[PDB]
Design a protein around this ligand. Structure first.
Ligand code: HEM
Ligand SMILES: CC1(C)C[C@H]2C=C(C(=O)O)[C@@H]3COC(=O)[C@]4(CO4)[C@]23C1
Length: 397
């Protein structure tokens, strides 16, 4: 008897920690320690998917004496309208109602075209440069920040101002840095709302300003803009890096994709499913029980914390035969959980899929000799950031 303690060690730079796969083999749910509260850890696909659709399991904390959180986690929960369990139903419903129509089929088709041209240009710049090159700086970082500039209607150079703010806001190791970074985001967004009130364009804040004959306050609109800025590029950057690394590890699949770029949607779904970095603390969706819930033989009690391991569930052999293998020829794969499921299902997921498809349609056809310029083991996953990620990806080609 030894209580498992999150985060678990992972001897590889990607994948699922061995201890978490061991727990998955024993059963769907286990009690574990963490750096803070103890929590229920749910690791099997069926149970994670069921619990993500359970309205009794919510982001907000219902407890009278709530455990202390990092500034970074507090900001993340507040951006997601989860900071007050009594107002979360109305506030979260409004948040999704206001953001979902900002990603319309008209907008996504226009952005798909612009994204494809931008990838072409980014890869031409890359191909013309002298290796070794940092792929993270010149490709992974550049496409999703371009997209956020487009969503917000700001000059592309603005991403040189805001490009580190998601990392800084979500730095769990430094509350002062987290809070100072978030104030920069807030000031920038309030400036942007005031500009869009007199100079609107085809962009998200302009649409929110016009919503309900201007019924929303500038603070309400800036709040939603802050969610788009802080959630809308960093995780996509991380998936471009993880997808590149996964494809570099699987040369037979990589050659399949280079030969037939029509395999890119299937590759993107495998990248999302398998793309887990380091100790994988970002591949856990946190919840609190607002009512008692039974999982198998186990009772989750009102007030308990729950970690839904979407990463482990996406590796679950019960849901994906040979679940640890990258295979873009899977026939009718189950829907992975990398965008979540249920009430808080990723709002940007169709846009994120368009970005990743445009990149991986092109990458290995444009740079067939691309490969790491350093050992994989030298790549360092940043455990202190809620969103993890690598800081650099040196390549040659
Ligand atoms: C590959 C990139 C991405 C991944 C892997 C990802 C993953 C996720 C996951 C797992 C959730 C659910 C969190 C939870 O249930 O607690 C989520 C929510 C969310 N995502 Fe994404 N995301 C990505 C890209 C984006 C983009 C590009 C946008 C917008 C431009 C975006 C906007 C949001 C928002 C606003 C939420 C909160 C939804 C809610 O709380 O109702 N995400 N994302
Ligand atoms: C809103 C989020 C940025 C989406 C989710 C994906 C993430 C990631 O891939 O890094 C974030 C990690 O931390 C979380 O609590 C998550 C898992 O819900 C995320 C919050």
């Amino acid at each position: 008897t030894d209580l498992p303690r999150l985060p678990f060690d992972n001897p590889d730079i990607m994948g699922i920690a061995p201890q978490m796969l061991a727990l998955q083999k024993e059963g769907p749910i286990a009690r574990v320690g963490t750096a803070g509260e103890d929590a229920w850890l749910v690791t099997r696909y069926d149970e994670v998917r069921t619990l993500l659709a359970d309205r009794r399991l919510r982001l907000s904390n219902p407890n009278p004496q709530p455990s202390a959180k990092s500034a970074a986690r507090a900001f993340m929960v507040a951006l997601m309208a989860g900071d007050d369990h009594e107002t979360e139903p109305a506030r979260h419903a409004q948040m999704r109602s206001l953001l979902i129509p900002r990603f319309s089929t008209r907008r996504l088709r226009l952005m798909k075209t612009r994204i494809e041209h931008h990838v072409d240009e980014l890869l031409d710049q890359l191909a013309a440069s002298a290796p070794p090159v940092d792929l993270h700086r010149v490709l992974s970082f550049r496409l999703p920040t371009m997209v956020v500039c487009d969503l917000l209607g700001v000059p592309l150079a603005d991403r040189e101002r805001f490009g580190q703010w998601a990392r800084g806001t979500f730095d769990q190791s430094d509350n002062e840095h987290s809070a100072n970074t978030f104030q920069q985001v807030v000031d920038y967004m309030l400036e942007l709302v005031a500009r869009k009130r007199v100079e609107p364009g085809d962009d998200i804040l302009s649409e929110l300003i016009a919503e309900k004959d201007g019924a929303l306050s500038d603070a309400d609109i800036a709040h939603l803009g802050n969610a788009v800025l802080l959630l809308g590029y960093e995780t996509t950057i991380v998936r471009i890096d993880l997808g590149t690394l996964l494809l570099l590890r699987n040369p037979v699949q990589r050659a399949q994709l280079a030969e037939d770029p029509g395999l890119a949607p299937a590759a993107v779904e495998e990248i999302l499913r398998l793309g887990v970095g380091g100790k994988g603390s970002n591949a856990l969706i946190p919840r609190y029980a607002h009512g008692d819930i039974t999982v198998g033989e186990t009772v989750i009690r009102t007030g308990d914390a729950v970690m839904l391991a979407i990463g482990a569930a996406n590796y679950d052999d019960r849901a994906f035969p040979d679940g640890g293998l990258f295979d873009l020829t899977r026939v009718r794969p189950r829907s992975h959980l990398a965008f979540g499921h249920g009430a808080r299902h990723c709002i940007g997921r169709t846009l994120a899929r368009i970005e990743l498809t445009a990149v991986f349609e092109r990458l290995f056809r444009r740079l067939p000799d691309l490969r790491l310029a350093v050992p994989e083991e030298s790549l360092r996953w940043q455990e202190h950031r809620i969103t993890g990620g690598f800081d650099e990806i040196p390549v040659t080609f």
